[PDB]
C-alpha cells in the first residue's frame, strides 16, 4: 500500500518569529502494528517575511516507483494548506506555474554514512510535486526508505488566497529547517536543510542524522509500509 497513501497533518504554528510544525504520527508496519513518531519542525525565512496563524497543511505523500534495492526511488506529494475547523467536520512572482528542484542529502542512520542526490519538479500553487532520487554512496540503504520519505518541499503546497504563504514570500532567498523526529523505540532523526533558488531552480541541502534505531526494530529491519495519521 505505497500508492494512494493516508492523507497526514501537519500542524502549523507561528513562534519566535519563527513558522514551526507538529506532526503525531506513525509507520505502518508489515505485520499490521503501529510505530508511532513526533515530528517538531522549525522553518525560518532568510529574510523577514509576514506570518500566518496557526492552520493546517494536509499531505499526500506516495512512492510511486523504484528499482529492487531502493536506490533509485520515486515519489510523488499533494499538499495543500486550510484554516482549522477547531474540532468541527471539515468540508472542502519569481515562483512560476511550474518549477524544478535539486536536492543534495548527506546522512547517516546508525553510524551507516549514505549520499543522495535528486531532481523533481511539479506545480508549486496547484499542490503536486514529484522526484527522482538517486543513492549515490551508502547503497542500498541498510534501513527502511519511509523514513527519509518526508525529508525531500515546502515551496509546492497550495495556500487560500487568505493565509500568507511563508514559504513562497521567502523567496528568492528562501529559507531553512531544523527537524526532530521521536519514535516510540528511542529513534532519533535530526535534520537541517537549506532550501534556495538558483537559475530558477530550487536548491535543496539537506544533512540527517538518525541514531538509537534498534537493529531488530522496523527501521533497521525494513518493516515499515508508509505513513499514516
Known amino acids: 500500500g505505497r500508492l494512494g497513501s493516508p492523507v497526514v497533518s501537519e500542524r ?38 509576514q506570518l500566518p496563524g496557526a492552520y493546517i497543511v494536509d499531505i499526500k505523500l506516495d512512492i510511486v516507483s523504484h528499482n529492487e534495492d531502493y536506490t533509485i526511488v520515486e515519489q510523488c506529494e499533494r499538499a495543500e494548506g486550510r484554516h482549522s475547523t477547531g474540532g468541527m467536520d471539515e468540508l472542502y ?6 518549477m524544478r528542484f535539486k536536492v543534495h542529502m548527506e546522512g547517516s542512520v546508525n553510524g551507516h554514512k549514505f549520499e543522495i542526490e535528486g531532481e523533481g519538479e511539479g506545480r508549486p500553487y496547484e499542490a503536486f510535486q514529484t522526484a527522482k532520487l538517486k543513492v549515490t554512496k551508502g547503497g542500498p540503504l541498510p534501513f527502511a526508505w519511509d523514513i527519509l520519505s518526508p525529508q525531500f518541499s515546502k515551496a509546492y503546497i497550495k495556500h487560500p488566497a487568505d493565509i500568507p504563504d511563508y514559504f513562497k514570500l521567502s523567496f528568492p532567498e528562501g529559507f531553512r529547517w531544523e527537524r526532530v523526529v521521536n519514535f516510540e523505540d528511542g529513534g532519533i532523526i535530526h535534520v537541517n536543510q537549506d532550501s534556495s533558488l538558483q537559475d530558477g531552480v530550487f536548491i535543496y541541502k539537506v544533512k540527517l542524522r538518525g541514531t538509537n534505531f534498534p537493529p531488530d526494530g522496523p527501521v533497521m529491519q525494513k518493516k515499515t509500509m508508509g505513513w499514516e495519521a
Do not use: C, N, Q, W
Not at 504520527?25 to 525565512?45: M, N, P, Q
Open 12 to 49: 502549523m504554528y507561528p513562534e519566535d518569529g519563527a513558522l514551526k510544525s507538529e506532526i503525531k504520527f506513525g509507520l505502518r508496519l508489515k505485520d499490521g502494528g503501529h510505530y508511532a513518531a513526533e515530528v517538531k519542525t522549525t522553518y525560518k525565512a532568510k529574510k523577514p517575511v
Open 93 to 98: 512572482a519569481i515562483i512560476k506555474e511550474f
